[PDB]
Amino acid sequence: MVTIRLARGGSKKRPFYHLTVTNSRNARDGRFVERIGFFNPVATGGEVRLSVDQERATYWLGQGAQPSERVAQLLKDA
Amino acid sequence: SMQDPLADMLTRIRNAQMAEKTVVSMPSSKLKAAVAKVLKDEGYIADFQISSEVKPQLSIELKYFEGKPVIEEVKRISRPGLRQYKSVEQLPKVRGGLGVSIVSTNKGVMTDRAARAAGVGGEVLCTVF
Amino acid sequence: RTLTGRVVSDKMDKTVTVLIERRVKHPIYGKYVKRSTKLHAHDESNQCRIGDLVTIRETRPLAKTKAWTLVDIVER
Amino acid sequence: GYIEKLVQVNRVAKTVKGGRIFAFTALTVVGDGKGRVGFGRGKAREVPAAIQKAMEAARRNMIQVDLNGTTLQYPTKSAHGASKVYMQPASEGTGIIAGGAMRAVLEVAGVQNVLAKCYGSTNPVNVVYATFKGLKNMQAPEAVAAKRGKSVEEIL
Amino acid sequence: ATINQLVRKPRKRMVDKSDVPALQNCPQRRGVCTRVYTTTPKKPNSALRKVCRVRLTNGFEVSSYIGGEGHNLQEHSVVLIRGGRVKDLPGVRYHTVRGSLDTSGVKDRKQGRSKYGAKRP
Amino acid sequence: ARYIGPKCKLSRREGTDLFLKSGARALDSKCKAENVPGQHGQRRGRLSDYGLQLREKQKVRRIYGVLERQFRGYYQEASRRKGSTGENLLQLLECRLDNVVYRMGFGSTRSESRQLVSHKAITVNGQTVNIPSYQVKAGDVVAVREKSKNQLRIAQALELCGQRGRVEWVEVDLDKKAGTFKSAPARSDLSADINENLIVELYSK
RNA sequence: AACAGAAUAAGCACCGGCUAACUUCGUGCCAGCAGCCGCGGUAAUACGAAGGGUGCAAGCGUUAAUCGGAAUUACUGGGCGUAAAGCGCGCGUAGGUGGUUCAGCAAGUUGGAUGUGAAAUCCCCGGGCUCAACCUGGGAACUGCAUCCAAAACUACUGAG
RNA sequence: UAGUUGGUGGGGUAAAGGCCUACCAAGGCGACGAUCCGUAACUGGUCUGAGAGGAUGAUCAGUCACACUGGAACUGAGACA
Ligand SMILES: [Mg+2]
Ligand SMILES: [Mg+2]
Ligand SMILES: [Mg+2]
Ligand SMILES: [Mg+2]
Ligand SMILES: [Mg+2]
Ligand SMILES: [Mg+2]
C-alpha cells in the first residue's frame, strides 16, 4: 500500500515532522514519492504548526493513499 | 596554399602600421569586404574601395592620430582548427568595453555592442583594441 | 527517433550493418572529434548493397545484438 | 613631490687582486600619492649613502599615471625580460594584494584596488620595468561614453 | 603542442612516491630493536651519532635514530618509531619517540618537554 | 578565555593611548609608556613589512577583547556581505553587546562592561542577556536590571562619561538607565589610527 | 528565585635568516641541534640552562596523508640556434585543415518553449534555540540530455560556375 | 571466438532473445585499443582552487553485491532466501 505518514527531522528533544507520501515498506528517513507539508509541535512566535497543502492531498487521497493516526487529525484540523 | 584568408587581412594591417604606410591592397572576398565596413563605422581606418573586375581588390587607408597608430593590437580568435563559439552570457569583453570584438551572428557581421543589445550570440572573430 | 547511415556489409542472412558517424566534442579541449558507431539493422528482404545510404529505427529485439530495423533506402 | 619607499639592497663585489672590493646597490621608488611615480637605482660604498643616491635619481625622469581613482582603467598584461605581469582593477574593500615589489609601486601611485600577480622570473629590479610599461601606456578614455564611446576616442 | 595532438595523447601527470616507504599510511609503528651502532656523520660535520636498527611488525629491517642525551636502550626492547629524515647520516629515515613504551624520555630538562617526553616539576 | 594580566604593558608596546585603563587619572603616569617593554626597551629599528600588518591586526584585536578564532569568524561574515569588507568588519565589532554597554557609559573600562553582562545585570528587549557577543540591532532598548541599579560601579562611571561625550548613534537616560541604540555607526566616528586596509590584506597571505 | 564567598578553576611551542619576538651563564669539532641554508675547534643572540619577550589558548605541538603555492603536464596558461628538447632525408595510406562567385538545404551555431536533472549539501532572503554552532520556510542553481518552433552570417552537405 | 555470428523448425519463460535444441550458412568483433594482466563497489556529494581543474566516495541518502565454503531447488504475490 501507499501511505501518508510523518518523518522526523531536527535535533534532540526538538522534533520537526514532514508529511510525506511513501510506499509502506520503506524506512522512515528513506525514499518517498513526494512531500506536501510539515508539522512543528514546538512552534513559538512567528512559526507555523500546520502547513498542509490541500491540492496534492486532494489528488492522492482519491487514489487509495492510506493515512496514519496523527495524519487522520491533521488533515481534519485545517 | 594559404589556409585562412582573414588572418591574412589582419596581418597586413598590423605590418603596414610599422612601415608607416598609408594604403594597403590585398585580395578581397565577401567577408573581408564586410569586416572593413565594421572597422570603419567603429573608426580605425579612413575608407575602403572594391575596385577591380576579375581580381577584385581592397584598398584600405590607415589612420595616425600620433606617430603611434590608432590600432595597437589585433588577434584572431576563431582560428581554423579551433572554431570558437559563444553564447550571450559567455561572450567576452575586451578592456572593460573600450576595444571592439567582432561577432558573426544570425543577423550579419556586427560588433559585440550590437548583438548583445539584440541578444544574439554567435562566433567570435577578433579582439581589436 | 530516426537515424541514417551507410552500409558496409552484406555477408549475413537478412542482416545488414551500418556506420553512423557522430561529432562529439572533447570535454576539456573544446574540439569536435569524429567517433563512429556500428549497428546491426535487421534487413528484411536481402536487397541492400554495400555502399548505400539507408535509414533505421528501433524495434523490439529480433535476434540478440540486432534490434534496429530498416525504414527505407534513400539513395544508392 | 616626495614619498620614498625602498625595495632592494644587495652586496655586489669586484675582484681586483689581493682582496675583493665590496659595494652596495639599492632600488628605491618615489611617488606622490596621486599618480606621479619614479623609480631609481644607485650604487655606492655604504648603506646610508647608497640610499640617498637612489632617491635623487628617482625624482628625475618620472611618470604621469592616469588612474581612475584608487583603481585602474582596465585589465592589462605587460612584460619585460623574462618577467610577465598581470593586473586588473577590483572592488572597493579589497586592498592591494601583490608581491613584494609591485606593492611598492602601487602604494606610491595612490591606487588601492589593484589585484595583481607576476609570473616568470621574479626579479625586483626587473619586475618594475614590467610594471611601468603597463602604467605609462594607459588611455583614460576621453570619450562621450564607453558602450557608445567609439567615435570620439578613436580619433583621439 | 597543438590541440590535435593532445586529443590523440593527453597530458599525463607524473606521480611521486612516499619518502617514508615503510609504515604504509600510518603515523607511528612499533618494532623490536636488534643492534645499537654508533656511526660517524658525513664530511662537513664531526660527531658520533647513535643509530639503532629495528625490525618492525611489517617485517622490515630499517635503521633509525635516537635523540635526547642518553638512552637506556638495550637490545630486544620494543620501541615506537616515526618518520623524519635526518640530513646528516646516510640511510637514516626514522626517529624514535621518547617516553612512549621503553625509552622513558630524558631527565632534568625544562625547555620543550612535550618533545622528548618530560613531565612538569 | 579572556586576557588576565598587565594592561599598561599592551598599551606600552604598540605606543598609543589605546584606552585600556579605567580612570581619567593620567596616561603615562601609571604606565610609563615611553618604551617597548621588556629588558631591551631601548634598542629599536625597522619593523618588518609583515610585522607592520601583524602590528595593526593585533592593535584592533586588543581594543575590543576578541581572540583569533572568533576574529576570523567575523572576517568570514565581512566577506559574505556586499561591499567594503573593511567597514563591515568594524560594524560587526561595534554592534557587539560589550561595546554598546561601554558606549552608553555603563562602565569605566570595556572589561567592566564584560562583567556587567556576565552577571545577568543587563537586558536588551526586556529580557536578560548574559552573552558578551550578542549582536544588537537598530532600535534595541538596552536597559539595566532593577536588582542592580544601586551599584556604585554604574553610578561612578557616569561621571567618567564627561570626558567622553555622546557618540551620536546612542542616547542614554541618567535616571532609569535605559539606553537606546539608535542606528549603525558610520565611518566617521571611528578614529583614523585603525586601518581597514592592513587587516584585510593580512588574511590573504 | 534564594543562600556561601574572590572563594572552585592556565598551560604549550618558539625567539640566526625565511618569521612576530634576546641577552647573560655552562659547553668547548665534545655532547648535541636541524623544514632548508647549516651552526659547535675556549668570548655560541642557533647546543644545555636563567631572566626577558612574542604567538596562540582549554588546548598547544610533532608525525602521517591530499589539494594549493607549482605558468613544475601550461584547454584557460609554457617550450625546442647554444640551457633538456626538430626524426639522417624522401614519397605516401588513415586522419586533420580548404582559393573565389551564386543557389539550395538546416547537420553544426544562436534564440525560445516543454519534459527532465530525487530529497539533502552549497549559495541567497527570511524564521526558531538568551547568542552562535544547530534546526528550518521560499528562491536561485544543478553547467546536462531529449522533443518542438524560428532565424541564416560563418562552417558542413548539395547544385552550378 | 565454434551456440562462436546469423537463418529456419520445435521447445521454454509472467515477457522479446541461441534462452534451448535439431539441422543450415561461414560468419562476428579489433589500433576509435578487442583480448589479457593489475587494482577498485559505483552515484548525489565532501576537501582544496580566484577560476579551469585536481584528488577523493567516513557519518546522511539512492542503487548493486553477499550472510561460515561450494552447490541446488521448493514454498510463494514477489526468495534461488
Ligand atoms: Mg580564584
Ligand atoms: Mg638555546
Ligand atoms: Mg597547475
Ligand atoms: Mg607526404
Ligand atoms: Mg536537489
Ligand atoms: Mg591556481
Neighbours of F126 (CB within 10 A): 7
Cα separation, F200 vs F205, in Å, equals: 10
Give 3-state DSSP helix, strand, coil % of chain E, rounded to 5.
5, 30, 70
Could you count the other beta carbons within 10 Å of the beta carbon of residue F139?
Answer: 10
Q: What is the CA radius of gyration of chain D?
A: 18
- Can you tell me which residue has the cell 625547555? E111
- CA C57-C58-C63 angle, to 5 degrees, is 120
| Spatial CA neighbour of F203 closest among D97, D70, D88 | D97
Helix F97-104, helix F85-94: angle, nearest 10: 70
3-state secondary structure chain F: CCCCCCCHHHHHHHCCCCCCCCCCCCCCCCCCCCCCCCCCCCCCCCCCHHHHHHHHHHHHHHHHCCCHHHHHHHHHHHHHCCCCHHHHHHHHHHCEHHHHHHHHCCCCCHHHHHHHHHCCCEECCCCECCCCCCECCCCCCCEECHHHCCCHHHHHHCCCCCCCCCCCCCCCCCCCCECCCCCCCCCCCCCCCCCCCCHHHHCCC
Alpha carbons within 13 A on the beta-carbon side of B4 = 15
| Residue A35 CA to ligand 5 centre (angstroms) | 13
Cβ neighbours for E3, distance < 8 A, ≥ 6 positions apart: B81, B82, C29, C30, C31
Cell readout for F127 is: 529580557
CA distance E77 to E31: 8
Q: What are phi and psi of A6, to 5 degrees?
A: -110, 130
CA nearest neighbour of C36 among C2, C74, C6, C61: C6
Cα(A11) to centroid(ligand 4), Å: 74
Residue D113, class by beta-carbon neighbours within 10 Å (0-12 exposed, 13-18 middle, 19+ buried)? buried
Q: Please report, as a single letter, which amino acid is at residue F83.
A: G
C38-39 β-sheet, strand order: C38-39, C17-19, C3-9, C53-63, C66-75, C41-42
**C-alpha cell belonging to residue E1:** 603542442
Helix axes F110-118, F97-104, angle to 10 degrees: 110
Sheet holding D116-120, edge to edge: D76-79, D83-87, D116-120
In the 49-78 stretch of chain A, whose C-beta falls under 7 Å of nucleic acid strand G?
none
- Distance, in Å, from the CA atom of C32 to the CA atom of C50, rounded to the nearest integer, reads 28
Q: Are E113 and E119 in contact (CB under 8 A)?
A: yes
Strand pairing report for C17-19 and C38-39? antiparallel
C-beta of residue F105 within 8 angstroms of C-beta of residue F94: no
Do F91 and F9 reside in the same domain of the chain?
yes
Report d(CA F21, CA D23) in Å as an integer: 51
CB A46 within 7 Å, strand G: yes
CATH number at residue E77: 2.40.50.140
Q: What is the CATH number of the domain that holds D18?
A: 3.30.160.20
Question: Closest approach of chain C CAs to the CA of B82, in angstroms?
Answer: 7
CA dist F56 and F46 (Å) reads: 15
Domains contained in chain B, number = 2
Kindly state the cell numbers that stand for F185.
555607526
The C-alpha cell that represents B54 in the structure block: 576579375
Specify whether the CB–CB gap between F36 and F13 falls below 8 A: yes
Dihedral sign computed on CA atoms, order E24, E28, E33, E38: positive
| Straight-line distance from the first to the last Cα atom of chain B, in angstroms, rounded to the nearest whole number | 30
Enclosing domain of residue E42: 1-121
Q: Decide if F197 contacts F57 (C-beta within 8 A).
A: no
- The angle at the Cα of F15, spanning F9 to F21, to the nearest 5 degrees, equals 50
Residue D50, H or E segment: helix D47-58
Domain that holds residue D44: 3-63
In total, chain F counts a number of residues equal to 205
Q: D54 in the Ramachandran plot: left (φ > 0), alpha (ψ -120 to 50) or beta?
A: alpha
Cα A71 to averaged position of ligand 1 atoms, centre (Å): 57
- Put simply, whether E47 touches C (Cβ < 8 Å) is no
DSSP strand pairing (A2-6 vs A66-67): parallel
Q: Which domain holds residue B102?
A: 72-129
Which residues of chain E make contact with B81, given a CB cutoff of 8 A?
Answer: 3-4
Cβ atoms F147, F80 nearer than 8 A: no
C-chain residue closest to B80, CA distance: C31
Q: Which residues are CB-contacts of B8 (< 8 A; sequence separation ≥ 6)?
A: B2, B26
Runs of H (alpha helix) within E1-121: 3-6
A1-78 fold: S16 Ribosomal Protein; Chain: A; (3.30.1320)
Count Cβ neighbours within 10 Å for each residue of D132-143 and write b for 16 or more, e otherwise: bebbeebbebeb
Cβ–Cβ < 8 Å for F203, F60: no
The sign of the dihedral angle between the CA atoms of E78, E79, E83, E84 is negative
Residue type, D67: L
Q: What is the CATH number of the domain that holds B37?
A: 3.30.1370.30
The C-alpha cell of B82 is what?
A: 579551433
Dihedral, CA of residue F101, residue F104, residue F109 and residue F114, to nearest 10: -10
The three cell numbers of residue D20 are 675583493
3-state SS assignment for residue B15:
helix
| Partner residue opposite B43 with nearest CB, options D74, D141, D151 | D151
Rounded to an integer, what distance in angstroms lies between the CA atom of residue D127 and that of residue D83? 6
C-beta atoms of C26 and E4 within 8 A: no
**Contact (CB<8Å) E4/B81:** yes
Chain D positions in Cβ-Cβ contact with residue F85 (cut-off 8 Å): 93-94
Hey, which residues 6-35 in chain B have their CB within 8 Å of chain D? none
Answer yes or no: do B56 and B29 share one domain: yes
Please, what is the Cα angle at D41 between D40 and D42, to 5 degrees?
A: 125
| Method used experimentally | cryo-EM
Is residue D25 a contact partner of residue D47, using CB atoms and an 8 Å limit? no
Q: How many CB pairs under 8 A join C and E?
A: 9
Q: Is the distance from CB of A2 to CB of A64 less than 8 angstroms?
A: yes
Query: B82 contacts in C (CB within 8 Å)?
Result: 30-31
- CA–CA separation, C17 and C38 (whole Å): 7
Which own/partner contact pairs does E39-46 have at CB distance under 8 Å and 24+ positions apart? E39/E89, E41/E88, E41/E89, E42/E88, E42/E89, E42/E90, E45/E88
- Calpha distance B47→B36 (Å, rounded): 8
User: What distance lies between CA F158 and its chain's CA centroid?
Assistant: 18
Same domain, yes or no, for F171 and F184? yes
Other Cβ atoms within 10 Å of E43 Cβ, number: 5
Alpha carbon separation from D82 to B1, D101, D120, F128 (Å, rounded): 36, 16, 6, 66
CA of B81 to C1' of G99 (A): 18
DSSP string, D82-128: SEEEEE----SS------TTHHHHHHHT------EEEEE---TTTHH
CA dihedral (B83, B87, B89, B90) in degrees, to 10, reads -10
- The dihedral over CA atoms of B1, B3, B7, B9, expressed in degrees to the nearest 10, equals 40
The neighbours of chain D, by the rule of 3 or more Cβ pairs under 8 Å, are B, F
If phi > 0 it is left, if psi is from -120 to 50 it is alpha, else beta; for residue B43 that is left
CA of C25 to the centre of ligand 5 (A): 28
For chain D, the distance separating the N- and C-terminal CA atoms, rounded to the nearest angstrom, is: 30
Chain F residues contacting D, CB < 8 Å? 83-88, 196-198, 200-201, 204-205
My answer on whether F23 and F80 are in the same domain is yes
Nearest C-alpha neighbor of A37 from the set A25, A23, A55, A24: A55
Smallest CA-to-CA distance from B13 within B60, B77, B55 is with: B60
Instruction: Kindly tell me the number of DSSP H helices and DSSP E strands found in chain D.
Output: 3, 8
Q: CB–CB of F134/F118 below 8 Å? A: no
Sheet architecture: strand order including B57-62: B23-27, B57-62, B45-49
Number of structural domains, chain F? 2
- Listed as ranges, the nucleotides of chain H within 7 A of a protein C-beta are 5-8, 16-19, 25-30, 32, 53-55, 60-63
Element (H, E) at D49: helix D47-58
**What single string gives the DSSP state of each residue in chain C?**
--EEEEEEE--SSSB-EEE----PBPTTT--B-----EE-EE-SSS---TT-EEEEEEEEEEETTEEEEEEEEEE-
Find where cell 572573430 sits.
B125
Establish if D147 touches chain B: CB-CB under 8 angstroms. Answer: yes
Q: Do β-strands C53-63 and C3-9 pair in parallel, antiparallel, or remain unpaired? A: antiparallel
**Distance of alpha carbon B74 from alpha carbon B126, whole angstroms:** 7
Neighbouring chains of A at 3+ CB pairs under 8 Å are: none
DSSP-derived 3-state class of residue A19: strand
Which of F107, F182, F201 is CA-nearest to residue F151? F107
Half-sphere exposure of F29 (CA within 13 A, CB side): 5
Name the 3-class secondary structure at B53: coil
Burial B18-30 (b: 16+ CB within 10 A, else e): eeeeeebebebee
Footprint of strand H on the protein (CB under 7 A): A 26-27, 29-31; C 9, 11-15, 17, 27-28, 34-36, 38, 40, 42, 60-66; E 13
**What gap in Å lies between CA E62 and CA E56, rounded to an integer?**
8
Grid cell locating A18: 514532514
Strand G at less than 7 A from CB of B92: no
**Residues of the domain holding F65:** 1-96+191-205
CB atoms within 10 A of CB B125: 21
Taking Cα atoms as reference points, which of A74, A22, A76 lies closest to residue A49?
Answer: A74
Phi, psi of D40 (to 5 degrees): -155, 145
User: In Å, how far is B21's CA from the nearest CA of chain D?
Assistant: 18
Partners of D87 in the β-ladder: D76, D116
Q: Map grid coordinates 640530513 to a residue.
A: E87
Residues F2 and F52 in one domain: yes
The sign one gets for the Cα dihedral D122, D125, D130, D132 is positive
Do the beta carbons of residue D108 and residue D31 sit within 8 Å? yes
Is E4 in CB contact (< 8 Å) with chain C?
A: yes
Tell me how far the alpha carbon of residue D90 lies from the centroid of ligand 3, in angstroms: 24
Positive or negative, the Cα torsion across D113, D118, D124, D128?
negative
Can you say whether the dihedral through the CA atoms of E77, E78, E79, E81 is positive or negative? positive
